[PDB]
Write a protein that binds this ligand. Structure first.
Ligand code: NA
Lengths: 304, 307
């Protein structure tokens, strides 16, 4: 009986071919090389003493094309143009990337998942699955030198880039932009005091994962009880869960159909787990309720 | 303080080796290195003869024309075929232009590797897992995943250590090295087989507690130490592997980095086993995690890259 539901990232090859190193002064981070453009975080032009309140327009007054070193592997790419767009730079290079995949830039919404290719000095180190949290942070694994690492989904042969890495907040969660250079959430690329909102739990994702658990033979948490959307939402609020909407109930329809467990019966199971805990039991090898699988992730992994 | 994730190796070097192999109606995955495609030998089985297939006898009735190899949109001509233990080696007419630097390695229990899960010769996802002490792995494999490979990367070289063959009734997975030899006592027939005792990889749990301290989770640290002797008496009671001097030696670099003695961390683990977490979490788990090696921790916390 299948019971191996795991956190799974997209194969990283199509993205690996796009990673380069960008150096400005003594600051080295990663860039994304698509066609003849390299995208990177605009704070590549910052200096150590001016991180608190950089004036990016003022900082660009003293920057020429030759102040940007771009290296694809060990191949020097000549910068022939540079512009600032939102919180990214666009470096025009003399050579189009021959490994440019079919790609799109997409904006994700809270609750949606994506793969991160963590890189250092334009070289891939590892790949893992993230979700955009309700507070617009991600729980990544990023060190000094990881800025410019990207998050993506792969759909058919199309790479949808959704994330570029910029910063680490004091609770060790991560903030960044889409590939248009607009921050997720309220964050700014300066070292002024910023805090992640209270983390809340992605309720529609927890319910998808309880459906995964049923498909994978974990049934111990199923009960006779039904609830209402209103009464469930009173419990969600108390346990710092996101509201469950009728739109979420519609999104969970296919999983309720596949398992024959009504969405509001699975809500009754979740209510009983929040109120009573797990009584030293596990679900899909966790002692915690997992919220970083979407309904779409469960369907894809459980049936391909 | 900072984050620490189950991280897979980048998969690009492997994706360029995955092909589709069909024998009769059976389609699974193969590994295309130079002019050889490696796949599970049970590609030659029929549905009604899975209990005790005679592989030698099935295979003499096979010709090159019975093996259809496809790399993307491109049919490869099979020009030779041999059996090596539980894998076929299909000599093809075209050497794989995307063949990386590689070795075949057989990993030890407690060691970790990345799985590139593939279906119809197309890579679908990547995740990290460990060789369990019972020589199973806790993978995520559906119908069609057979021939998917596990690997590590060092510098620019891919070390292939696993090829997927089967799912046991508890939903754990069994397979071979790339010499075609199973990990553990498993055999590629549908005769009753069961995984042995699932024991916790103690040295890995200690590595993960060092990872937690590096990433600012300190609550489980106590001013206590234990002897190895006294720790292992407690380990036995909770189906933990005994901790050996070799394990203590491998944990030495994390002990030095954190300045927390290995036997101090053992005292923290003994308390966690005896008392639980009392509603706290370590690196966002409410369980003790055993699928990070000491090397995995250093690699992640020091940002080691590949090409
Ligand atoms: Na001792």
């Amino acid at each position: 009986h299948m019971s191996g539901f795991r956190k799974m990232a997209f194969p990283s090859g199509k993205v690996e071919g796009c990673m380069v190193q960008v150096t400005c002064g003594t600051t080295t981070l990663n860039g994304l090389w698509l066609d003849d453009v390299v995208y990177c975080p605009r704070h590549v032009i910052c200096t150590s003493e001016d991180m608190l309140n950089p004036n990016y327009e003022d900082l660009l007054i003293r920057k020429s094309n030759h102040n940007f070193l771009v290296q694809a592997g060990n191949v020097q790419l000549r910068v022939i143009g540079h512009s600032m767009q939102n919180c990214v730079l666009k470096l025009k290079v003399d050579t189009a990337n021959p490994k440019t995949p079919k790609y799109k830039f997409v904006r994700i919404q809270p609750g949606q998942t994506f793969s991160v290719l963590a890189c250092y000095n334009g070289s891939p180190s590892g790949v893992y699955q993230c979700a955009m949290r309700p507070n617009f942070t991600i729980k990544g694994s990023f060190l000094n030198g990881s800025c410019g690492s990207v998050g993506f989904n792969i759909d058919y042969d199309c790479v949808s880039f959704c994330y570029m890495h910029h910063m680490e907040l004091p609770t060790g969660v991560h903030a960044g932009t889409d590939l248009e250079g607009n921050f997720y959430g309220p964050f700014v690329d300066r070292q002024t005091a910023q805090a992640a909102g209270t983390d809340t739990t992605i309720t529609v994702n927890v319910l998808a994962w309880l459906y995964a658990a049923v498909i994978n033979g974990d049934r111990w948490f199923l009960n006779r009880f039904t609830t209402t959307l209103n009464d469930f939402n009173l419990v969600a609020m108390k346990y710092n869960y996101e509201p469950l909407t009728q739109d979420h109930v519609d999104i969970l329809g296919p999983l309720s159909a596949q398992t024959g467990i009504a969405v509001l019966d699975m809500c009754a199971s979740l209510k009983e787990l929040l109120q009573n805990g797990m009584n030293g039991r596990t679900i899909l090898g966790s002692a915690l309720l997992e919220d970083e699988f979407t309904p779409f992730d469960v369907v894809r992994q459980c049936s391909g």
